[PDB]
Amino acid sequence: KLSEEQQHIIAILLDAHHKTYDPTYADFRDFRPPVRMPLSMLPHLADLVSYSIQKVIGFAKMIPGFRDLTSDDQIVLLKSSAIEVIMLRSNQSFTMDDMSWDCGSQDYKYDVTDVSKAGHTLELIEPLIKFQVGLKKLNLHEEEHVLLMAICIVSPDRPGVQDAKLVEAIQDRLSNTLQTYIRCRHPPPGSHQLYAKMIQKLADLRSLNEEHSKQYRSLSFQPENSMKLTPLVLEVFGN
Amino acid sequence: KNHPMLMNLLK
Ligand SMILES: C=C1/C(=C\C=C2/CCC[C@]3(C)[C@@H]([C@H](C)CCCC(C)(C)O)CC[C@@H]23)C[C@@H](O)C[C@@H]1O
Numbered sequence A: 001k002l003s004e005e006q007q008h009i010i011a012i013l014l015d016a017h018h019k020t021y022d023p024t025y026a027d028f029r030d031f032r033p034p035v036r037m038p039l040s041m042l043p044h045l046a047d048l049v050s051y052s053i054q055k056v057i058g059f060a061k062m063i064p065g066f067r068d069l070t071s072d073d074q075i076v077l078l079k080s081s082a083i084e085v086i087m088l089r090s091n092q093s094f095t096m097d098d099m100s101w102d103c104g105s106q107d108y109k110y111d112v113t114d115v116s117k118a119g120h121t122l123e124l125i126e127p128l129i130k131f132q133v134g135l136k137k138l139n140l141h142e143e144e145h146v147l148l149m150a151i152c153i154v155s156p157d158r159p160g161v162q163d164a165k166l167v168e169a170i171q172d173r174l175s176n177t178l179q180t181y182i183r184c185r186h187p188p189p190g191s192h193q194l195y196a197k198m199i200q201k202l203a204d205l206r207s208l209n210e211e212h213s214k215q216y217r218s219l220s221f222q223p224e225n226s227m228k229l230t231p232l233v234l235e236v237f238g239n
Numbered sequence B: 001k002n003h004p005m006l007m008n009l010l011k
Helices: A004-020 A026-030 A042-061 A071-092 A112-116 A122-137 A142-153 A164-185 A194-221 A231-237 B004-010
Strands: A100-102
Touching: A004 A042, A004 A142, A004 A164, A026 A042, A042 A071, A042 A142, A042 A231, A042 B004, A071 A122, A071 A142, A071 A164, A071 A194, A071 A231, A071 B004, A112 A122, A122 A194, A142 A164, A142 A194, A164 A194, A194 A231, A231 B004
Parallel strands: none
Antiparallel strands: none
């Protein structure tokens, strides 16, 4: 069975997610508008990403144990995982119907061609789409989804982590909660090797992270592209 | 180093 501590952890992570992910996408109006006539989708998508960093941080703060870490380690962890959690949380809007991210209206519906209109290439976009499909196929329960995001954030192997023993202990408590949840609450056949398939997604995210960071570096070396970013995006991703 | 915005958002 799920212990009462494990039930608590799930309860908090569900709530923390409901409080940082608005499924009506109402705030999207406040973004610089999408242009599909260059890098015409860069202003819109930088604002979307910037907004999403803030939400990921809000989610992170509420992870049981996260607040016992130093502010230094909190920083390393959020800085390296932000892109990954944005990719994960975006699965909620992703749809296999047309391989797009559907945020409630045609204006806020993003496809392969919109992402390339933000200065990215297929070297990132094709594996990102593949990631989104494989993840959607897992048909995760909300409980598994929020647990996966939290485990991704609290990873002990990120470069620059000082107290790695403590980061691993916080994560172990989440990993164990996830494994037990799958065994007690996820009925076969869906549950088939479900944990190991979720952990593999965390591997895939490392590759996507490395490729995004490479193209981000190339995109942002140009001061005219950098001008189109936000201060938070520049602080978190670089330069 | 120096992440003043990230540090503000964290608390
Ligand atoms: C964000 C969210 C959403 C979509 C994410 C997407 C679709 C458009 C392209 C994105 C933003 C990818 C881009 C490769 C990132 C580019 C960023 C930059 C231009 C700065 O290098 C990563 C995740 C993709 C919508 C909603 O699910 C909220 C979530 O929070």
